[PDB]
Design a protein around this ligand. Structure first.
Ligand SMILES: O=C1[C@@H](P(=O)(O)O)C[C@H](O)N1O
Ligand SMILES: O=C1[C@@H](P(=O)(O)O)C[C@H](O)N1O
Ligand SMILES: [Mg+2]
Ligand SMILES: [Mg+2]
Ligand SMILES: [Mg+2]
Ligand SMILES: [Mg+2]
Lengths: 438, 438
């Protein structure tokens, strides 16, 4: 007899704009407005060590604005043709909305409008549709995911010591992370992260080392080896009153594609030694023997599938092996990885593929195969906390959203705290059990 | 005959919670919910080099949580006594809401509930009431301020090189900043900042200096003197293709309190040389003749009032002299400063005094005496962008909200971008003429 406003979920307006990300580079933000007055707003993140098979960002390449990194053309895609194609459509139909943008762009890698333009609209849409349905984003996402009412709070892998490309040290491994698997709630996990992070600063200050931070809020001190990184962390964990290996485990992102040349892995700060696939795998195995490293990400080059089959054979029963640049959140690639015994986990980055619908498809493929899914940030982030709702709504079980500093990271932890406060034990923090091989 | 929901502006619930700030320390967030369904949310920032006379930030001191920096007591204050005193009150009456909290705390420095508790609610209340009136925060702020429909976009001062206490170098001056006075819009100002910040990273790398960032997203490289901080900024400005003095002026925060002992200013990075108050003023003066430094903040110790009078005589006709620790956003102190010819500008930090109403009284006192007001962040921030709305809605003319990295900073620039998009020339960017002494 009376039609409520929630039923008026047709798109009446889409606005795009150029804003600034956490590294000072432009990004695209979109607003999606519905007939009933609901609005969602979202922005695209941006990677610094991008896989070669990622969907493509659209930048302007004008050297007189933002050193060629403007996104005014992606913004005009949002305001002109994306807007045109979606006005009149039901935001609640996420898949239909995404399919429209994908077909209109027409390219394999979203190179006409940019995966940045398309993703920002895909996420803003989902938020507008959640508002129209009278629910928080995490709840809407679970329904779009095919898993209505099923939540978990994820176990975070928190970056605290950095190496590799553009880190003034002899550390080759791009990220060393702590995971507070002994916490009972995500709120306690976050407190634990914070305590270790502040104790690490004290440790590094006592060694004379630098405590300024990188892109992800963690430290990049002048260390002498990949091993010294694991030791300062061990020292910080103990000063915080926690036990390495039962309260807190360790995870790594090697970003090994960055040090792979002419078929060998070159460890620039490890006497500059060169390694085969098989040898770099054994170098990693030994590290997991000396330290409670339970997860290793991109331990070989994104094209070294023979090498990944062997790493999975050696380490996979015991260690989570996370493909990032390996799978680029792409179902066509993940599929083949699964069929070939390649890795046992996937890092989920929605701007690697460019839409929410295809991101949920990757999570689903992974879970169907017994692979774990770790929801992730990019180096370039914004104040947007969408990956927190996403992690909870897909019950992914793990998240990777930075150190315990910079609001580009901390906003996601804050949102995890608001969501857990609301769900309580309807969103269990499962701890060590989430991690492939425990 | 029918009442809108907007008229149901009575408070029905206030929730407080403990979240995390951009340094990894706890802070207070509050939600104010009104009968008509309107909700506002805000969080208190936190200083790192606080004035002696700031209102009190209440922390817990429990070593078992966050190294003693929990805010559960301030949170309990929000949830219990503050909520009980505000339920049933009209959120549109900001002065009346704040008065209730102030009278109920009962202390001069808000040391019973914490200025962090009271501020979070004061801001949250204002946001909820903005929504209840059907308007953006900046517009509501202008109406609260007694200046309805009067707006400007602030000229930002952007902190790109760091020294002082939280900086691992021999630069004594806490902050070196650029101001893009030559810009025509804030959007362009922001673009200029980003470009200069990226060119600075290249300049610093070519000198083999570290390009990681401190709390405010600026660089803290190992420079030999205070003057060398100015010189590398001028390389970066030129390498970005801008003209120092015309497109971009310079500003500084001395935080000179931090290096005052036994009545002298000791510059650890001009080889421990001790300066009388007047010689330090001469030191500053000499920098302003070498570089187009147009603003100097906290150039003497907060209690060195005779020094400040002197500094005002020497510098105040040509240079903006900003009291931060000197005035602590406190009308009692600022009044006395106005009376004594002390400074000509005030840094406005709402958590130094504890309420929006008292903040607006500080801005008004400044402007009534011809002093400029610069709305400011603290080192410890969140994803909250309230100071952008506050700057525009009071037409303050200036903002200090950090470097062009970290979303604890960039969120504020982004919100300035959204506001300028909505207002256009209803919110002029006035450029250099905002700065006291031009
Ligand atoms: O490889 C990476 C970088 P990127 O910016 O996403 O490339 C940061 C992220 O933690 N991760 O897994
Ligand atoms: O003195 C200060 C520090 P604080 O954290 O607020 O003390 C950072 C800010 O720019 N300002 O003016
Ligand atoms: Mg990468
Ligand atoms: Mg990675
Ligand atoms: Mg200070
Ligand atoms: Mg200051």
């Amino acid at each position: 007899q009376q039609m409520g406003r929630g039923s008026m979920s047709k798109i009446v307006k889409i606005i795009g704009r150029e804003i600034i990300d956490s590294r000072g580079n432009p990004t695209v933000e979109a607003e999606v407005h519905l007939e009933g007055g609901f609005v969602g707003m979202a922005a695209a993140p941006s990677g610094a060590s991008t896989g070669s098979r990622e969907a493509l960002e659209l930048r302007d390449g004008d050297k007189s604005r933002f050193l060629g990194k403007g996104v005014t053309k992606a913004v005009a895609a949002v305001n002109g043709p994306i807007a045109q194609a979606l006005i009149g459509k039901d935001a609640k139909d996420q898949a239909g909305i995404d399919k429209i943008m994908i077909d209109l762009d027409g390219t394999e890698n979203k190179s006409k409008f940019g995966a940045n333009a398309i993703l920002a609209v895909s996420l803003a849409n989902a938020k507008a549709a959640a508002a129209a349905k009278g629910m928080p984003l995490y709840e809407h996402i679970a329904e779009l995911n095919g898993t209505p009412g099923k939540y978990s709070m994820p176990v975070p892998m928190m970056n605290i010591i950095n190496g590799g490309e553009h880190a003034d040290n002899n550390v080759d491994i791009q990220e060393f992370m702590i995971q507070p698997v002994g916490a009972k709630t995500v709120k306690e996990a976050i407190r634990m992260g914070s305590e270790v992070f502040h104790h690490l600063a004290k440790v590094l200050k006592a060694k004379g080392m630098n405590t300024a931070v990188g892109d992800e809020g963690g430290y990049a001190p002048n260390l002498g080896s990949n091993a010294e990184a694991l030791a300062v962390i061990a020292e910080a964990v103990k000063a915080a009153g926690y036990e390495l290996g039962k309260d807190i485990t360790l995870a790594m992102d090697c970003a090994a594609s960055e040090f792979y040349k002419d078929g060998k892995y070159v460890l620039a700060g490890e006497g500059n030694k060169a390694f085969t696939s098989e040898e770099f795998t054994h170098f990693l195995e030994e590290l997991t023997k000396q330290y409670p490293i339970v997860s290793i990400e991109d331990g070989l080059d994104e094209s070294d599938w023979d090498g990944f089959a062997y790493q999975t054979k050696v380490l996979g029963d015991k260690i989570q092996l996370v493909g990032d640049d390996l799978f680029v959140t792409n179902t066509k690639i993940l599929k083949e990885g699964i069929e070939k015994g390649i890795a046992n986990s996937i890092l989920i980055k929605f701007n690697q593929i460019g839409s929410l619908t295809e991101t949920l498809a990757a999570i689903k493929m992974a879970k169907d195969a017994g692979y774990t899914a770790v929801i992730s940030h990019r180096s370039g982030e914004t104040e947007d906390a969408t990956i927190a709702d996403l992690a909870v709504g897909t019950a992914a079980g793990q998240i990777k959203t930075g150190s315990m500093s910079r609001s580009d990271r901390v906003a996601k932890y804050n949102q995890l705290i608001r969501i857990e406060e609301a769900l309580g034990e309807k969103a269990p923090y499962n701890g060590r059990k989430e991690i492939k091989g425990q």
